[PDB]
Amino acid sequence: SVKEFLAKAKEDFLKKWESPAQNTAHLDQFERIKTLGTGSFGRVMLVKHKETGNHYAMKILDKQKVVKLKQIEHTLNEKRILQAVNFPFLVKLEFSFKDNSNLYMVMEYVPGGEMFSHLRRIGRFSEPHARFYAAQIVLTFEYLHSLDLIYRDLKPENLLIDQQGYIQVTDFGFAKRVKGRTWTLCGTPEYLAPEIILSKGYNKAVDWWALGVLIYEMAAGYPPFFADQPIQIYEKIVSGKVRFPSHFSSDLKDLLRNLLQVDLTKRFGNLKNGVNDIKNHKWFATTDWIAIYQRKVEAPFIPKFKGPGDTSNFDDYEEEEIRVSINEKCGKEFSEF
Template sequence: MEKQLQDLRQQLEKQCLINQELQRQNKDLEHRLQEKEKLLQELQSQYHELEAPTLSANESEPAYRTSRAAVIASEPIPETVEITRSRVKKTASETSLIVKAIQKNDFLSRLDDEQTAMMVDLLVVSNLKVGDEVIQEGTEGDSMYIVADGVLVVTQAGRELRTLSSGDVFGELAILYNCKRTATVKATSAVRLWCMERHTYRTIITNKSKKKREQLMRFLKTAQTLKDLNDVQLSKIIDSMEEVKYQDKDVIVQEGTEGDTFYIILKGEVLVTKNVNGQQKQIRRMVEGEHFGEQALIREVLRTATCTADGPVTCFSIDKEVFEETIPIEHLELFDDSKVLQQSRAPVKASLSSTLTLEDMVPVFYQEGRYQGDPVTLGVGGFGRVELVTTLKQGKYYAMKRVSKKHIVSKRQEEHMLFEKKILKAIQCDFIVRLHAAFKDTRYIYMVMEFCSGGEIWTKLKEVGRFDEPIAVFCAACVVEAYSYLHKKNIMYRDLKPENLMMDVKGYIKLIDFGFAKELVRGEKTYSFVGTPEYIAPEIIKNQGHDFAVDFWSLGILIFEMLAGSPPFSSSEPQRIYAKILDGVLKYPPFMNEAAKSIISKLCRPRPGQRLGNTKNGIKDVRHHRWFSSMNWHKLRVGQINAPTVRLIRKGPCYINFDRFPADQNKADEEFSGWDRDF
């Protein structure tokens, strides 16, 4: 018996040694796998860099985005804007210098001839002495400058960066939106500058866009084929049309060829000729506002005449394939426009019936780490901070957004704040964070929101570098459902990015932060400059007026960033980001599959009317794209899918999935203007 026990003991000891050796080997294998995965990611990012467009010498971009994106809050602008400045006459040489400066500037070079001419007209002169500062680092700016004569020095934190001389442009970001200056510019000689304020620039661009849109609407209403379409449908056609230019004697349409394009003449004249006994006989001459080729939009036809440019001609055109995506041919009366207007103006029902009070809210404290004993902060942004709170009665967790009233007033965001509360009050959607209560005192506005314990998608993306495709598909599908809900209520979101996506305990994704959302009647446009630079659609940058299509653009950017680790258009300088967006060249990493490339390229089409989600079938086209082929949309809506994102959620204290932030030691000043009377 004793011998058997001894044998058993020896066998157990032997087995323990084997187990220990296996554990050691497993750890070793795990370590080697991690090293290989790290090396693979490095190689992929290096390969991606090789594939990417060449960067300028002073710019380097990480493989993955590592810092939070900045946001641009829209400034309230009047619906009708007028230019108050008088035009300043310039000599031929001055005009030439200004035009050359605009043409060589990465951003301003995108202005058309008419916009450039208006800028030249409205630039005003400013004279400086040696030592005068034009721009001071850290201050807010509202003007851009072109150097006419003299030399200036650019410094940052006291360090000299470069000099500026005749023909150089600086400060141009300030004509797009209110931003802090990143450097100081000082005159080192007598200097003469051409200057333009933001209000003047935006008025030039906005007025031209509005006039052009009104002009196109008038032209379209004269087309016999389109006479039964309402303004909403005509607006969609305008969004899908493209500007094309022809030189003298260019043939636009050839008699006898198959036609598939409709044209409106914006500028210039077009000769219409027909072949009679082998000779081209002129039938008529068409001028601005006239159109041709409309029959090609609805049936297979051969061109019955030849149309030739008589001098330079600019047309707006749409081809049959794009037209069919925009307007269902089989029944032109898609819906009654008055119904849309009634829906958009229907009163919003309040859903806040909470009995919570501000006094009920108790902060949750960090239990360990460097901030132990401090209140838990879930996030910090330009407009306040979000803190984790609980209630003694319920013991339930909430995320409480706290924003300085003085800050809201100084940034002229009162309307946005009131609208954010109004939207969240009315929303009942599983893919959008819930508002439980709202309060105010003399210093702050408080919004008590649903707590999503899984953390920000941004934090998770930063941790892993980039998402596996099933995770990206699931996250994007949740966003599609949130968009579907909002767009039916005529609400644009306008601030999609990983920072504004939260995970609940089940890993389902919810949209947060409605500070930039806006209600819009279908067929109308809004002209504010708003969003996050990397995610802004081209029509916002161009001040052409935008609508729900901007949300589909940002969905394409989000899918790209989730799969690649960084957005497709990025730079340390916002001007470079905008230039890249307007160039529209999407450079995909080698590991991205064809379905992903397809949905991104369709969502990020430059013309808003051609974007996936914004054509005649609406958001259905997004759901039916092959990249989402694995998604059961019904099961997603009823919460029956096991979210692949669950594996990103860490176990531990309720705040374990959030970045940590130090406590706020400063108290906001009191504010008594009364704008929040109805909050």
């Protein structure tokens, strides 16, 4: 049963949430290969675990930049949550640790590359292709929300394709365990729900709105609200008018009018029937959820894998020396990491 699985899932999560794993590896157990991606206060690198020969992806966050951009609390959220969760489509945290300069999170290496890269290159995905990914995001948000977690940073930039062509969700930087409502103005301009922009309080429904932006971008090739300047993007999100490409199917557009819904009383995911309003939507009719969860379904796209440690699915980034200061920076701020 789903309730049964989730109840067992919750009991597993809670024991880890209350008793977080900490300091389970050290920088020197890993050989650094290549920068796979960057962010405002850090970067992610392909690494190899010396003792087993396994490959992993290591996220390195600069503590001082986290503080300058006031992201201390957000970062503690990310690790605490990530180590407690366990789902087929979540990038697994294999180990975490910190040093004088940085925080470290060592995740499974997902060799297929970012959805973003494939999306911009190909232009757009077919609907059955976009659906296969969307279904996985749907199950993942069901899992996540059942734990009282809000995700808040969905975008193609934050989704990876695995070796059998299934999706893996990454970046828990804005994720938060919250039962009530919250106020932080955060996320990516194109993906912000209107309630975030207008400084109202908000909840898990912002994730379902973001899913709507994602599905639209995957199927259209561009986002529903864009302009040269964020101020102008907000003016567009807030006005709420949305236009769809002519090739979007009816089921798709309907699904999106409901996810991209400014009225919180009407947004899909946020109603009485919860996520089932989405799983049972016509656009997903051909989707077998159990088979999807069991990974028994054939993926629409199997990435080219030219061997272990291959990185040809990621862009090249300027390599910077990973410098670790001789002084502890911001020790008190990150004590529990």
